[PDB]
Write a protein that binds this ligand. Sequence first.
Ligand SMILES: Cc1cc2nc3c(=O)[nH]c(=O)nc-3n(C[C@H](O)[C@H](O)[C@H](O)COP(=O)(O)OP(=O)(O)OC[C@H]3O[C@@H](n4cnc5c(N)ncnc54)[C@H](O)[C@@H]3OP(=O)(O)O)c2cc1C
Length: 314
Amino acid sequence: HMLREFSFYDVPPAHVPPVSEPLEIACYSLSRDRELLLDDSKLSYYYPPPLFSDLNTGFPNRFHPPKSDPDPISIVKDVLMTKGIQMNSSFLTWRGLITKIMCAPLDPRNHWETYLVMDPTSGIIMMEERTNQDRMCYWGYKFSAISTLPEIWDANQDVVPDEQYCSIVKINIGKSKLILAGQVDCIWDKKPENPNLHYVQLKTSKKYPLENYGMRKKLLKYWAQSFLLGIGRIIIGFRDDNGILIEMKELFTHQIPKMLRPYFKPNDWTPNRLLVVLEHALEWIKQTVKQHPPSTEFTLSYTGGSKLVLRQII
Ligand SMILES: Cc1cc2nc3c(=O)[nH]c(=O)nc-3n(C[C@H](O)[C@H](O)[C@H](O)COP(=O)(O)OP(=O)(O)OC[C@H]3O[C@@H](n4cnc5c(N)ncnc54)[C@H](O)[C@@H]3OP(=O)(O)O)c2cc1C
């Protein structure tokens, strides 16, 4: 029936919106066995793994595949409620769902759909999905496992991506106040001061020159993901086609837009342009939803092309 559309290319060329430094307000850990713990017992330390590590080791016999079902955002609301933290923001969602909105102009092939509801008591707009274990995905999980060390002093080989640590963050993008929950791979040193600049994101990739358009898009997606949670470092394990780790590359998240500056072609999406469009997208979602009573359900869909489409559910 009635559809509302947002076009990436209808966005006027504006100045980049102000974005505050993400502020951690809560954190939690998920045990191997899915017990949610209100502590940082699953937060690991980064330690550089040996070069020429074989990322195939343990696949599939030591691989406990991830659950492969979306998590309801009510988990985060309940964390904040349990800790007595009030939600006076515009959006509550998983970091990765803002990454999808922000990076949609970058990859028209990644099709996705989210569900949105305004909570009647707090007025916040909650967003979730209701809709990853092949060898290449394992290389990524295995790179994280071999590059991290659990807490030992104040506390096997199995690769268990379901065991996680999560930071819940307040971040303002232009006039939209967001509460975002995201997974944190490990920390660079002791957990303090706001800790997110101490956090580290781990990635594995084949190495291409920055002249390569696909390499630049990938780095922009790495940047966007970490930027939204205030992650200070991205550490990339470059691997060859055999899955052997060949080179380690430590990046500061804020350096990725600087590093890419000499390589952008005149048509390319840039960090600043992505932030402008995202800010207009979020204002459009908020305006559209707030034009409905709370507890009205919406879907937000991207199916290629250059628009988002918002539908009221029947
Ligand atoms: C059908 C479906 C299945 C899903 N299955 C999982 C799952 O098994 N485990 C999980 O943590 N989240 C899964 N999700 C996504 C969750 O609902 C939720 O959005 C996410 O866990 C929230 O954490 P974020 O940190 O915001 O997620 P993101 O920023 O999107 O990604 C951060 C990290 O979460 C992991 N991750 C994210 N998405 C998936 C996925 N689809 N499958 C496996 N790992 C993923 C992975 O370690 C990733 O690091 P890396 O990017 O280096 O690969 C699934 C979503 C859908 C629609």
